[PDB]
Design a protein around this ligand. Structure first.
Ligand SMILES: O=c1[nH]cnc2c(Sc3ccc(Br)cc3/C=C/P(=O)(O)O)c[nH]c12
Ligand SMILES: O=c1[nH]cnc2c(Sc3ccc(Br)cc3/C=C/P(=O)(O)O)c[nH]c12
Ligand SMILES: O=c1[nH]cnc2c(Sc3ccc(Br)cc3/C=C/P(=O)(O)O)c[nH]c12
Lengths: 262, 262, 262
């Protein structure tokens, strides 16, 4: 039962953090993990693997940390590490962190991800607010007749507040793909035709699960590379894996300023 | 084996109905089920639960009935309550009623559904004939080298006959998506680019099964809402259900009149 | 571990062919099997069934044979028949042959398929070079964080070599669908907009697995039919077979001539 696992998780978070309510939660992608220190000083740090439902029975142990960070007036639940669909787990395990955070009081979910830019005007190292998504995974985290509206899934309100922090923040449509292979240049030309500005391998299921629970979502991509076929050179996975470190302080500063305005 | 289970269902169906052969079958969508009464009144009701292959043995009280109804010269199997792909069961369960109906003698399947309207001419409460479909589920109900042609899958002949009942009927391409979440606005703009006029969460697998089994198909959508981002307004799931209820009489009367013409 | 089973298949291929290393591998799909004779005189032939990890190919014509063929300065591993995703197999089994080929030395993978032509200038019986692919299966054969760049997935070098053998050879973008149903005319019109020239039900996962394992790929489609709705008539799936036989000694001699140039 996702609801039951989510409440058992929230209880242990409340115990281990001695805080009964975290009103904001941030999921950090690979691209945003470097920024963790620049968010603020945490009051508690525990292994995600010690939390009910975080470690998919499939196998392995989540390599990720949960952090409790005071930012402005807010008490922030920071999830440093996420599970991806491309690891082969049921989506229940992929969106569990979002549901656990909701059951722990989260009103707002900041979902960060790495992405390829598809739009001429995007640069490597640029943070881009997510205006909307294309779920191209042919899956949903919802089972049975759980009908949810995905109008304004990325709160226009939270994007206004983000732009009060930095009026030059660009907006884009994020295409969520299964991965883990990068796209062919032909797949990228297809995604351009379908209205995509950004391409990644996360987020869309977390957004659906967050909206189904009634939480507000802010989505932020880090453009870690231009998308396949755009440069005329191949994608370097080394340049991509290292992209977050080139932007850590700038990204951490941005998240901390924007969360303070919620 | 699906085909085996469909033949045994058809044997039980002929025994329990006293009817050796049902020449037509209707799958009632969510937005059509309330129109069961205006089709005619049945000679037999059957609990799906008591029929070979209909209900996964571990299932929630989905209820579901198979009715035997006379309409003009026709003995019509009416499926009241279908298994959607978003319940998460094998597609063999989703298409079993079409295969069972075929084995029972149905050479015409009337496939009904609820749909979001993408085309500017379409309004809430409008029945629309299906001219063709986009299968955006990345699935097929067919396994191995069952290779089947979907040219004229929605019989032009049957759309002709429908239009003798109501000559004003529009027609449109239906996109079947997994669901159960509704589309983001950006997903709808994508489906417009791809050539969809209607969007729903069923029908496409049933059509493929029907054509593979050698039955003609008439598809009918009730437009229960404008698709996401067609207005500036979010989708209401309650107004989608209201449109179902509100269209009941007109939709049952339409099907009844169309089926007498076959 | 797919990689252990691939190694162990390569050791058994080596011991039963008495050939330590094959530098080139050819996957012959549906309607290429006729061309196997004209590739050259095999040194050895084995049943694919005798090899660890190989599922018996069950499709039309598919022999389940392995042939060790000398062609120019190359020792060619010819897989006469493949496993399709539409048979319901985990992709680890679909791409196992490509991985085994690679563990036995394959530097180059020649992947052939049947395809429908979406450009009406293409002729039944025409071989078309694959320039790029659209993976429309919503799947990957890679599991966990296996990040692979698919820029130049279909080696430009190898297509230039093929055009040296036959300068008239067309190239096109292959849309890989799940199958096994053929597409609606609406779906074909959708695939044109997504930038596809060819449509089939194989190859894309084999290509990803080959690039993942460090092999170069040449893709060659045989146009067996014009795609649904391109001509007003339906598709004939006994005339899809007739293209395969008509294109035997032509195809087989083209492949032998192209590999000699590698
Ligand atoms: O061009 C692109 N295509 C498709 N996807 C991408 C990503 S997404 C990514 C790339 C590398 C690592 Br490691 C992890 C992830 C997921 C990250 P997450 O932040 O969403 O968890 C970045 N660039 C592209
Ligand atoms: O905008 C839209 N997007 C996607 N799907 C839809 C449907 S489909 C539906 C809506 C409510 C209930 Br309850 C069930 C279903 C499935 C119904 P079925 O009729 O095919 O069985 C109506 N409108 C939309
Ligand atoms: O118009 C078309 N649409 C989609 N696909 C095709 C194929 S290819 C094919 C069609 C049906 C079955 Br069943 C199997 C295969 C693949 C065999 P392969 O091993 O060569 O890939 C030929 N024409 C079309």
């Amino acid at each position: 039962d996702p609801d039951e696992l989510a409440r058992r998780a929230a209880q242990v978070i409340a115990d281990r953090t001695g805080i009964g309510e975290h009103d904001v939660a941030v999921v950090l992608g690979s691209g945003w993990l470097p920024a963790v220190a620049a968010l603020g000083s945490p009051t508690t740090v525990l292994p995600q693997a010690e939390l009910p439902g975080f470690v998919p029975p499939t196998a392995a142990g989540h390599a990720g940390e949960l952090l409790s960070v005071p930012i402005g007036a807010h008490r922030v639940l920071v999830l440093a590490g996420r599970i991806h669909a491309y690891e082969g787990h049921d989506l229940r395990y992929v969106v569990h962190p979002v549901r656990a955070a909701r059951a722990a009081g989260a009103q707002i979910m900041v979902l960060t991800n790495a992405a390829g830019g598809l739009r001429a005007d995007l640069q490597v190292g640029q943070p881009v607010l997510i205006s909307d998504h294309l779920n191209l995974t042919a899956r949903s985290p919802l089972v049975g007749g759980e009908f949810v509206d995905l109008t304004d899934a990325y709160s226009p309100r939270l994007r206004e507040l983000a732009r009060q922090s930095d009026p030059q923040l660009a907006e884009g449509v994020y295409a969520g793909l299964p991965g883990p292979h990068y796209e062919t240049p032909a797949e990228i030309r297809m995604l351009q035709t379908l209205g995509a500005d950004l391409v990644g391998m996360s987020t869309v299921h977390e957004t659906i699960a967050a909206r189904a629970a009634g939480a507000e979502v802010l989505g932020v991509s880090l453009v870690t590379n231009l998308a396949a076929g755009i440069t005329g050179e191949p994608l370097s996975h080394a340049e991509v894996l290292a992209a977050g470190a080139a932007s850590a302080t700038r990204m951490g500063a941005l998240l901390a300023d924007v969360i303070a305005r919620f």
